[PDB]
Amino acid sequence: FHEQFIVREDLMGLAIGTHGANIQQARKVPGVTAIDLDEDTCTFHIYGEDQDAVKKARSFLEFAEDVIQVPRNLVGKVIGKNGKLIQEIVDKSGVVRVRIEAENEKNVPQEEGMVPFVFVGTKDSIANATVLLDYHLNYLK
Ligand SMILES: [Mg+2]
């Protein structure tokens, strides 16, 4: 069992972690045979005995910067009082950071009626953040 994914080069220090701390975790996953980074393509290859093990290792390393578009009319539901809810969401989810971006009205490329929330984190952490977003946006009354 072998999987491969690309981690953008500016996120590489998150994937590897301070003195390899993060990649060390992915390596010590039982069942993982090997993890190799092809630095000229920023591609991790993870080799291992079962799929679950290789996926568990991918889980630590698969950093991304993904944009979620949040309806402007609902933005406050996700930010909270005392910017506290958005901080809890980042903290619970496990993401590294969210940037909420307000672009000048002249800036043409904008989904209409939307505020970009740009998360940096593992794919799984962003998935966690997304459920909490949707919960506060659409569900919670
Ligand atoms: Mg390089």
Swiss-Prot record:
Q: Could you tell me what induces this protein?
A: (Microbial infection) Up-regulated in response to infection by influenza A virus.
Q: Where is the KH domain?
A: 4-33, 67-96
* Expression across tissues: Expressed in the brain, cerebellum and testis. Also expressed in epithelial tissues. Expressed in mature oligodendrocytes (OLGs). Expressed in fibroblast. Expressed in neurons, Purkinje cells and spermatogonias (at protein level). Expressed in brain, testis and placenta. Expressed in neurons and lymphocytes.
- Where in or outside the cell? Cytoplasm, Cytoplasmic ribonucleoprotein granule; Cytoplasm, Stress granule; Cytoplasm; Perikaryon
Q: How is it modified after translation?
A: Phosphorylated on several serine residues. Phosphorylation by casein kinase II (CK2) promotes interaction with CAPRIN1 and liquid-liquid phase separation (LLPS) for the formation of a membraneless compartment that concentrates mRNAs with associated regulatory factors. Phosphorylation has no effect on the binding of individual mRNA species. Monoubiquitinated. Polyubiquitinated. Ubiquitinated and targeted for proteasomal degradation after activation of metabotropic glutamate receptor (mGluR).
Effect noted on mutating G48E = In FXS; reduces association with polyribosome; reduces RNA-binding; disrupted FMR1-network
Describe the function of this protein: Multifunctional polyribosome-associated RNA-binding protein that plays a central role in neuronal development and synaptic plasticity through the regulation of alternative mRNA splicing, mRNA stability, mRNA dendritic transport and postsynaptic local protein synthesis of target mRNAs. Acts as an mRNA regulator by mediating formation of some phase-separated membraneless compartment: undergoes liquid-liquid phase separation upon binding to target mRNAs, leading to assemble mRNAs into cytoplasmic ribonucleoprotein granules that concentrate mRNAs with associated regulatory factors. (Microbial infection) Acts as a positive regulator of influenza A virus (IAV) replication. Required for the assembly and nuclear export of the viral ribonucleoprotein (vRNP) components.
The extra comment attached to this record reads: In the absence of FMRP, these same mRNAs may be partially translated via alternate mRNPs, although perhaps abnormally localized or regulated, resulting in typical fragile X syndrome.
Q: How does it assemble?
A: Homodimer. Forms heterodimer with FXR1; heterodimerization occurs in a methylation-dependent manner. Forms heterodimer with FXR2. Homooligomer. Component of the CYFIP1-EIF4E-FMR1 complex at least composed of CYFIP, EIF4E and FMR1; this mRNA cap binding complex formation increases in presence of the brain cytoplasmic RNA BC1 and is dynamically regulated in an activity-dependent manner to repress and then possibly release dendritic mRNAs for translation in response to mGluR stimulation.
Identify its protein family.
Belongs to the FMR1 family.
Q: What is known of its domains?
A: The C-terminal disordered region undergoes liquid-liquid phase separation (LLPS) for the formation of a membraneless compartment that concentrates mRNAs with associated regulatory factors.
Q: Which disease is it linked to?
A: Fragile X syndrome: An X-linked dominant disease characterized by moderate to severe intellectual disability, macroorchidism (enlargement of the testicles), large ears, prominent jaw, and high-pitched, jocular speech. The defect in most patients results from an amplification of a CGG repeat region in the FMR1 gene and abnormal methylation.
User: What name appears for this protein in its UniProt entry?
Assistant: Fragile X messenger ribonucleoprotein 1
The organism named in the record is Homo sapiens
User: What high-level taxonomic lineage is stated for the organism?
Assistant: Eukaryota, Metazoa, Chordata, Craniata, Vertebrata
| The encoding gene | FMR1
